[PDB]
Amino acid sequence: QINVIIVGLGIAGLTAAIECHRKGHKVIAFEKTPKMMHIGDIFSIGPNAESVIRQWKDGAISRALNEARCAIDEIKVFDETGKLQNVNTMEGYREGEGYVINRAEAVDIFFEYAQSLGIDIRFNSNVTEYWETPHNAGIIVDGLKIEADCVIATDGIHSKARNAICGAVVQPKKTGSAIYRSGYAMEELRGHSGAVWLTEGKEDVDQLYHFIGKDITVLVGTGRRGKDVYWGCMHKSLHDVSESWIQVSDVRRAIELISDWNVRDRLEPIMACTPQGKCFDHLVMTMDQLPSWVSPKHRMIVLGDAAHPFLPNTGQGANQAIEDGATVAICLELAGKNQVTKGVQVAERLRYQRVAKIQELGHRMLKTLQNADWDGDEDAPTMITRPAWIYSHDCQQYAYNEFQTVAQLVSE
Ligand SMILES: Cc1cc2nc3c(=O)[nH]c(=O)nc-3n(C[C@H](O)[C@H](O)[C@H](O)COP(=O)(O)OP(=O)(O)OC[C@H]3O[C@@H](n4cnc5c(N)ncnc54)[C@H](O)[C@@H]3O)c2cc1C
Ligand SMILES: CC(C)=CCc1cccc2c3c([nH]c12)C(C)(C)[C@H]1C[C@]24CCC[C@H](C)N2C[C@@]1(C3)NC4=O
Ligand SMILES: [Cl-]
């Protein structure tokens, strides 16, 4: 039986823990916060991650995500003047495909499942020290050495593990954009006469709007059939007021960003009714491609945002974190106890080029999105591209199919 240490329990670490446990490994998982604590905005989980999730507990996790979904039928795309420019379908996010869902709700569902499986989960563990030998690897918690066969570091874009595992040459860096993200109860908004366009007449169907202007994108949506309201704002900034870490926002700053938008009259009420503490902001950070995700003695690997952050317009960060977790569990299973380092190296090789291709697509799309060149549809600004090579990929089948080939190359 393979002993795995997992550090960081966001989507990446929770998926790795669940999948490692399901594939028969013994997991010890470490988390810095006292309990799950996530921003209550929304994110999307597409089919390439649903094919992992659908296997858990005879579909009960998928059904719980489905119950909690934003029941969105279409995306309405406007320019900054308020002109409707495009209506997109929700292909990839309809029943049985995928979900737009409250982030904290989804993490709670994953966490509740991981805990139900009996996985050893240790909160209040801020991990900074890693070590490995030819024979084992582990961490240092409270001056105590914890040993395992391998360490999976899924501690996010500000990973402390990454310096230890990959060295410190490559660091996260500012893109020049920043983001406001918010979710709150619709009861706080409904009654505002400037919000009737959102709050009335929608007959139990959730909404999702994109407002695309030069260097500023605003998104507005609802969840749980009108019970929750969500909004956010990604914008290119000349002088930073946001930081590389997340902060609670003063929403009055976001209102000023759209001061020159004709539609501001529609959007200001949604921002202004945000309760104190329910809007967050941060710089949009990126990172150059790491030469390697794996430690010199091949027992430690960074996965998730610690290894390959994506621009938020991609909508793939959580999906690829889920693919990473499912993949590493398989590589360890196929490698077996006596060749754990081979499994770690195969896991990196299986994923490395795919995630880089997704990162590069996100960078190209962000440029078009922020140019907002509405005159000139395959040239139009959009957050929506659903290429088959992303959405039809089955990471588990890929790992089972390619392991032997890739392992042979690793072994030589
Ligand atoms: C605005 C926005 C919208 C997005 N929308 C989407 C979307 O629609 N779809 C999608 O697929 N992705 C989306 N993403 C990306 C997605 O949120 C991330 O890629 C994903 O959450 C990364 O998860 P992670 O587990 O790698 O890292 P994190 O979620 O950052 O989790 C890391 C964990 O490690 C813990 N930790 C950190 N340091 C330590 C330490 N030293 N010791 C112990 N524990 C530690 C943290 O507390 C945390 O629990 C979006 C991102 C943004 C910003
Ligand atoms: C409103 C808010 C809380 C934050 C502001 C915010 C800022 C920047 C990018 C995004 C994206 C989102 N939110 C962003 C969604 C809506 C969660 C996602 C969900 C969705 C659904 C359709 C398919 C696309 C790819 N995905 C990505 C995404 C990217 N857009 C979207 O239409
Ligand atoms: Cl690409």
CA 219 to ligand 2 center in whole angstroms:
7
**Which method, experimentally, gave rise to this model?**
X-ray
The dihedrals phi and psi of 172, each to the nearest 5 degrees, come to: -60, 150
Name the CA dihedral angle for 391, 394, 399, 405, rounded to a multiple of 10 degrees: -80
Task: Decide whether any atom of ligand 2 lies within 6 Å of the 390 Cβ.
Answer: no
Facing residues of 100 across strands? 44
Task: Decide whether any atom of ligand 2 lies within 6 Å of the 329 Cβ.
Answer: no
> Element (H or E) spanning 234, and its range?
strand 228-236
Region(s) of the chain under CATH 3.50.50.60: 3-71+96-172+287-411
- Taken as a whole, the chain contains a residue count of 412
Can you give the resolution of this entry in Å? 1.9
Residues 6+ apart with CB under 8 A from 74: 87, 88, 89, 90, 208
Region(s) of the chain under CATH 3.30.9.30: 173-286
The closest-lying atom of ligand 2 relative to the alpha carbon of residue 182 is 3
The DSSP call for residue 127 is: -
What CATH code would you report for 173-286?
Answer: 3.30.9.30
Assigned token pair, 367: 């440029």
Cα of 294 vs its chain's centroid, Å: 21
Shortest CA distance to 326 belongs to which of 250, 226, 396, 279? 396
**Alpha carbon distance 265, 197 (integer Å):** 11
> Residue holding tokens 């960060």?
317
> Residue holding tokens 């490698």?
335
Cβ atoms of 315 and 3 within 8 Å: the answer is no
Whose CA is closest to atom 27 on ligand 2?
315
Whose CA is closest to atom 9 on ligand 1?
315
Catalytic annotation, residues: 181
CA 31 to ligand 3 center in whole angstroms:
33
Whose CA is closest to atom 4 on ligand 2?
232
**Alpha carbon distance 278, 184 (integer Å):** 6
Residues 6+ apart with CB under 8 A from 59: none
CA 353 to ligand 3 center in whole angstroms:
10
Task: Decide whether any atom of ligand 2 lies within 6 Å of the 391 Cβ.
Answer: no
User: Does domain 3-71+96-172+287-411 sit in CATH 3.40.50.1820?
Assistant: no
Residues with CB under 5 A from ligand 3 (ion): 357, 360-361
Assigned token pair, 336: 């077996």
**Alpha carbon distance 267, 212 (integer Å):** 13
Report the residue among 77, 179, 219 best suited for mutation to probe ligand 2: largest number of ligand atoms under 8 A from its CB: 219
The closest-lying atom of ligand 2 relative to the alpha carbon of residue 183 is 3
Beta strand 26-30 with 3-7: parallel, antiparallel or unpaired?
A: parallel
Neighbouring CB atoms inside 10 A of 143's CB total: 6
**Alpha carbon distance 310, 358 (integer Å):** 8
